[PDB]
Symmetry: C7
Subunit: 256 residues, 7 copies
C-alpha cells in the first residue's frame, strides 16, 4: 500500500547497484593488473571498491524507506568494524603476502627456516605459503608469522660452514690431532681452501678435549662434506692411536 511503492524503487536501485558494482569492480580489475602494480593488490582494491560502492548504493537505497543518512552510516560503521575486526588476522596475512613477493626474502624452491620449521618453499599463496620439509611433510605457514619473525634463508649464499666437534682423550698428543685433522681437510676436494680452515682446541670438557674443525664448502655439497670428513676422522683416528673417550669417571673406593 503506502510502504511497498518505495520498496520496489529501493530494490531497483539496489539491483542496479549490484550491476554497477560488478561493472566497476571488473573494470578496475582489468585496468590495474595490466597497468602498474600486481595481481594480488589489485584484487584487494577490486574487492574494496566493490564493497565500497555496494555500501554507497545501500546508503542511497535506505533513504527511500525514510531512514536518514546519519543513522545508516552509524549502522554501517558498526557493521564495518564488525567485519573489519573479523578480518584483522585475515588481512594481515594478505598485507604480508604482498611484501613477501615484492621484496622476496625467499623465492620458490629455496630451503628456508621460517622460525623453527625448515623446508623448501613450494609457493607463496595469497594468505599462506606452503613449504615441503626435508621429510616430505607439507607445512602451511600463514604470512603473518613469516614476516613477524626471522627468515633464515639457508640457500641464498653459495658457501656455508660446517662445524665438527671432535672429542678426544686427555692423554692424546695435541700436535698429532692437529696434524691429522689438518691432513684430512687439506686433501678433501670440496672444502674451500681460500677461506678460513680452523683446527684449534675449542674446550677442555669434563672427560674429553673438544677440538673444533670448521671448514667452508659450497651449499649444495655441505652435508656430503660433513658425512665424508666425519667418516674419515673415524677411520684415521683408529689407525693412529687416538682414542675417542667414553664418559670417564674417577671412582674412589671406601670399602666400609
Amino acid at each position: 500500500l503506502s510502504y511497498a511503492v518505495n520498496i520496489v524503487a529501493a530494490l531497483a536501485i539496489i539491483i542496479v547497484g549490484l550491476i554497477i558494482a560488478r561493472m566497476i569492480s571488473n573494470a578496475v580489475n582489468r585496468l590495474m593488473i595490466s597497468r602498474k602494480i600486481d595481481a594480488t593488490v589489485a584484487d584487494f582494491l577490486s574487492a574494496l571498491v566493490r564493497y565500497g560502492i555496494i555500501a554507497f548504493t545501500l546508503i542511497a537505497a535506505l533513504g527511500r524507506v525514510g531512514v536518514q543518512t546519519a543513522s545508516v552510516i552509524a549502522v554501517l560503521g558498526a557493521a564495518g568494524l564488525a567485519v573489519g575486526l573479523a578480518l584483522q588476522g585475515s588481512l594481515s596475512n594478505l598485507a604480508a603476502g604482498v611484501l613477501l613477493v615484492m621484496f622476496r626474502p625467499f623465492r620458490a624452491g629455496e630451503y628456508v627456516d621460517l622460525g623453527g620449521v625448515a623446508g623448501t618453499v613450494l609457493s607463496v599463496q595469497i594468505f599462506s605459503t606452503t613449504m615441503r620439509t626435508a621429510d616430505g611433510k607439507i607445512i602451511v605457514i600463514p604470512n603473518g608469522k613469516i614476516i613477524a619473525g626471522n627468515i633464515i634463508n639457508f640457500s641464498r649464499e653459495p658457501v656455508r660452514r660446517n662445524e665438527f666437534i671432535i672429542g678426544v682423550a686427555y692423554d692424546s698428543d695435541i700436535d698429532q690431532v692437529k696434524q691429522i685433522l689438518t691432513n684430512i681437510i687439506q686433501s678433501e676436494d670440496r672444502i674451500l681452501k681460500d677461506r678460513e680452515m680452523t683446527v684449534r682446541l675449542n674446550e677442555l670438557g669434563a672427560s674429553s678435549i673438544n677440538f673444533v674443525v670448521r671448514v667452508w664448502s659450497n651449499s649444495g655439497d655441505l652435508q656430503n662434506v660433513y658425512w665424508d670428513v666425519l667418516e674419515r676422522i673415524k677411520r684415521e683416528f683408529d689407525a693412529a692411536g687416538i682414542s675417542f673417550p667414553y664418559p670417564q669417571m674417577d671412582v674412589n673406593f671406601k670399602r666400609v
Copy 2:
C-alpha cells in the same frame, strides 16, 4: 494518556520491523546460498542485514517517543561496540572458517598436525574443526588457532621419509655396518629405490657411533616400513657380531 498513544505506534512500527527483518533476511539467505558464494558467508550476511534493519527500525521507532537520532545512534553505537567486542574471538573463528574451506589446507579425512595436536580431520564446522587423534580422542580446535599457526599436513604428499638412528659400538667395522644396512634397505620392497637412500655416519656420540638411515616410502606404509626395517636391523646385527652398546663408562679406580 499523552504518552502511550505514540508507544502503540512504536510497537506497530517495531513489529512490522521484525516482520520485514525476517522477510529480507530469508530473502537474501535464499538468494545468496544459490547464486554465488557459500552456505556460511551468506548466513553471516543474513545475520548482518537482519540485525542491521532491526537497528534501522529501532532508530525509526525511538523518534516517536521524542528521543532524537543523534542520541539513539550514540546509545546504539555504544551497544554495538559492546556486542562487537563480545564477538571478537567469536567472529575471528568464523572468518577463519571461511578461509579453511575456501583455500583448504586440509580436507576432511586427512592426517594433520594443527600446532602440537595431530589427528585425522573429521569436519570443519562454522567455528571449530573436530579432529580425531590416533588414540580415539576427539579434539575440537577453534579456527582462530588453526589459521594463526602452522598446518603440518602429513597426508597431502604421497612419499615421506623415515629416519632410523642406529647406535653401534666404537670398535665395529664401519664398512660392515654400511654394507649390512644397505643390504637391508636394498631388499625391502616398499622402500622407493628411485629416491635418496642414505646410510652414512651421522655422528660420533658419547658411547656409540650413530649411523643415520633415511629412506623414502609411500605415506600409507611409512610406519610398517619403520617397524619392518628396525626389526630386521635387530635381527641382522646379532647375526653379524655388531653390538648395540650400553651406556659405556670408563671408571678409573683410586682405592684410597
Copy 3:
C-alpha cells in the same frame, strides 16, 4: 528557586524512565525466552535494552537542566566506553558461554580436557563452567579460556586406544616376545578384535628394546584393560624367562 522547578520535572521523567525500563525489560524477557532463542542471550538483550532506555531517559532528562544533547552523549559515550572496557573479559565469557551450549563440544557429565586440566563437566554456567576432576577437586574454568583452546573430549567416541611400551633386554628372542604379547591380547576379552592390534618393535633404546602394544577397547573399560594387560605381562614374562632390564652400564676398568 529558578533552578529546582526543572529538577523536579527531571526527577519525574527519570522515575517514569525507571518504570518503563522495568516494564520493557521484563516484557522482552517474557517474550524472547519463550519464542525463539535462549534463556541466556535473551537476558543479555534484556539488560541491553534496559540500560539502553535508561540512557534514553537520561538524555531526555538532562536537557531539562540546560545541558545540550551533544555534550550529554559525549559524557555518556565516555562512561559507556568506561563500562564497556570494564566488561571486555566479563562479556567475552558470556559470548563464549552462548557457543558452548549452542554448539556443545561437551555436554554435562562428560570427561574432557580443557587445556591441561581434565575432568568431568558438571555444568556450564553463564560465565564459567565447573568441572570435577578425577581426584574430587572442583575447577571453575572461565568460558573465554575454553573456546580459545583445544577441547579434548575424552568421552564422545566409544572406542579408545591403549599404548603399552614394554622394555625387554637385548638378548631376548623377538619372536618369543611377539608371541607372548600376542597370546595375551588374543585372549583378553574386552580388547576389540576387529580393530588394529599391533605388537611390533618400536625402538632400540639405550639399555632395552621397547616393544609397543596398542590395542583398542571401549572407553568405559580402557583403564581396566590397561591394568589387566600390564599385570598379565608382568606375570607371563617372569614365567617365560624374559627379563625386564635394569638401567644397564658397561663399565671399563682402569685400575691406575
Copy 4:
C-alpha cells in the same frame, strides 16, 4: 575588566556544580545500596554519575568564557580516554570483583588454588582478594587474574582422593603386595568404603614396580589418611619381606 566578569559566574556555576555533584552522588549512593543491587556496583555508579555531572557543569561553565561546545567535548573526550586508558586494568579488577561475589567460585575461608598459588581465602576486597597460604604468607591476588584463570576450589566438595604410588622390587609377589595394600586400606577407618578403592599395578618402571593405591576420604582428614596409610605401608612392608628398591643398576665389567 572585560574578562573576569564572566570568570566569576563560571566559578559560581562550578561551585554549585560541585554542590549538586555531592548531592546527587550521595543520593544515588543512599538509594541504590538499599534498594536493589550491591554495595560495590552502586559506589561505581555513584562515582560515574559524580564525575559525569562534574563534566556536565564543566561543559556548561566553559561556554561562559567563549569556548564552544564542540571543542570542550573534544578536549574532554581526549582527557576522558586518557583517564579511561589509565583505568583499564584498574577497572577490570572491579568488574571481576563484582563477579567473584555475585557468582562466588569461592567464599571466605575456603582453600583454593588461584592459578599456582594455593591458600585459604580471607576476604574479597574491591580490587584484590587476600589469601593466606599454608605457611602463613599473605598473597594479594588482583581480581583480573582470578577470573581469567582456573579456580581450583579444594574445599567445596566433601570427598577427595589420595594417590599413593608404592615402588616395590621386581622379584616381589604381586599377589602378596595386592593383599597387604588391601588389608591396610580395608582396616583404615576414615577411608570411604562405598567408593572406588583401587590397588592395581600402575606401571613397570626402570628399577621398581609402581603400584597405585587411590582411596577416597573426607576433605578434612585427607592429609591424615595419607600420613597414616603411608606410615603403615612402611611398617607392614618391612614385616613381610617386601623390599622398597634402591635405584638399581646392571653393571657389566670389562677389566681391560
Copy 5:
C-alpha cells in the same frame, strides 16, 4: 601586513592563556591537596586542567588566523591520541600508584615478594616503588607490574611456618626418628606450642625416607628457628645412630 595584525592578538591571547593556565593549575593544586583527596591524584588533575585550558586557549587562538574549530579540534584530537598513546604505560603506573597507597598491600619497610623479586619496600614513588633486597641490591619495580601480579607480603602476619624435610635411611626405626624430632621441637623455645606441630612420614623417596617437620614460629625469628633446629637435628641424629643416607645404588655385577 594583512596577516600579522591578527598574529599579535593570537600571541596576546596565548600568553594570557599561559598566565591563566598557571593560575588555575596552582589554584586547584592549592585547593585539592588540602581539602579531600591526595597529594598525587590532585597533581594529576592539576596537569589535566592545565593542559586542558592550554588546549582551550589554543582553540580560541587558532580561530584568529582563519582556521575553523572543526579542524583545530581534529588536529588537536590527533595530537591528543598521539600524546595519550605515548603515555599509556606511563599513566597506568600512576593509576596503580594511587591504588598502592589507597589500599596498601604493603607499607614502607615490609618484606614483600612482588612477583619473583623479594625485598624490603623502601618507598612507593609516583611511578615506581623501590625495594631493597636481602643482599643490598636496589630493585625499582614499576607500579604496573605490582598491581598486575601477586603481592606476597611476607611480613603482615606475625606467625609463619617452617618446613624441614629430613631424609633418613630405609633401615632406621620410624618410632625413634619420630621421637627424636619430637623431643627437639618440644624443647625449642621459640616454636609455638599452641599451633600445629607435625612430625609425620612425608614420603618414601628413591634412597631415603623423607620425614616432614613443620613448626610455627614468629615471623621475626623464623630463620633462626630453622638454623637452630636443623643444626640440632644434625647433632642429635649422629648421637643416636640414625644415618643420613648418600644417593644409594644397587649395582648388579655381570663380569663378562
Copy 6:
C-alpha cells in the same frame, strides 16, 4: 586554465605555511628549552606544533581546490592514525626516556641489571640507553623495555652481601667448621663487623653439608672479598682436616 589559478594560490599558502611552521617551531624550541622543562620534551612539542600547523595550513589550502573541510579532516585523521600507529613503539620509548631522566632509577656510570642484561650505563639517549657490559660488549636497550621491567641498580647502595655456600663432608665436626669460618671472617678487614655476619648450617644436602656464610662489605670491593675469603677457605680447610666431598655414592654389590 580554470583550475590552476587556485593551485598557484594553494602553493603560495602552503609555502608561507612552511615558513611559519619553521618560525613557530624554532620559536617554541628557543623558548621552552630555556624557560621550564627539558631539552627532550620541548623538541617533542616543537615537532608536535610543527606538524600541527603544517596540518592547519593543509586544511586551509585544500579548501581552495573545492575540497571541503569535513573531508580533508577525514583523510587527515586517517593519515594521522596511520602515522600514529606507525609511531606507537617509536614514541613509547620517548615517553619512557623522559621518565628515565626525570626520576633517574640509574645515572650514567652505574652498574645496573635491566632485566637479564647487566652492565654500566653509558648514556640515556632519546629512544634507547646504551650500556657497556662487564665483558666490553655494547648493549642498546630501548626505553620501553627498561621502564616496563625491573631495574636492579647494583651500585646505588654502598654495602652489599656475599653468600658463600661451603659443602663439607658429613663426618666433619660442625663446631670446628663454624669456628674456622668464623676465624676467617673475623680477621678479614673489608668485611663489615657492625652488620650481620652469619656462619650457620644451611642445609643437609645429598652428599655434603652446606654451610652458608653471608657477610656484608662495601660495593666496590665485594668481588675481592669473595675471591679472598674463598681462597682462604680452601687454604684453611686443607690445613685442618676438613674435607670437601666428592659426589658420594653408596653402591650395594650383587655379584650375580
Copy 7:
C-alpha cells in the same frame, strides 16, 4: 540516459585526479629527498600525499553520482581503517627502519646480536635488515623486532674480555696454578697489560676447583687469544703435574 552523463564527468575528474596524483607525488618526492630529510621517509610522505589526494578526488567524484560527503567519508574511513589495520605491522617496520638509520645502533658490516641471532649486518633495507651469520646463513630480521629488543653490538668497542674457567683437582697447589696461569698471560703478547688481568679462585665445584682467568684483548683477535691461551694452558699443565680432573665419585661399598 539520465545516469551516465554524470558518470562520464566522474571518470574525467578521476582521471585528472590520477594525473595530479602522479604530479604532486613526484613533485614532493623530487623536493624532499634533496632538501632536508631522507630517501625513506620522503617516499612514505609521497605515498601518503598520493593516496591522500586520490581520496580527495574520490570524495569530489562521488558527489557527482548523488552520494553525499558524510557517507563517502564514512565508507572511506571504514576502508581506511581496513587498510590501516592491514598495514600495522607492515608500517611499524618502516618506522623502526627510520630509527635504525637515523640513530644507528649498528652500521653495515658490524657483528651484532639482535636478540638471539648473531651475525654481520649486511644492509638495512626499508622493512627488514639482512645479516649474515658466522656460518654463512642469511637471516632477514624485520625492523619491528630489532628496535623492540636488545642490540648487542659486539664490534663497536675495540677491547673485549675473555673468560676461561679452568677446573683443576682438589689436591693441587693453588699457588702453583695461580703462578702458571699468570706466567701464561704475562707472556702472551695480544693480552692488554694495562687492564684488569685476573687469575683468582672462582669456585669450589663438585669435583674440581674452578679458577677464573679473565683477560682483555682487542676485539679483532679475541678468539685467537682464547684458542692460544687455552692450548698453552693444556700444554703447561701437563708439564707441571697439575691434573684436569674427571667427574670424581666417592663410592662406598656394601657387599651384601
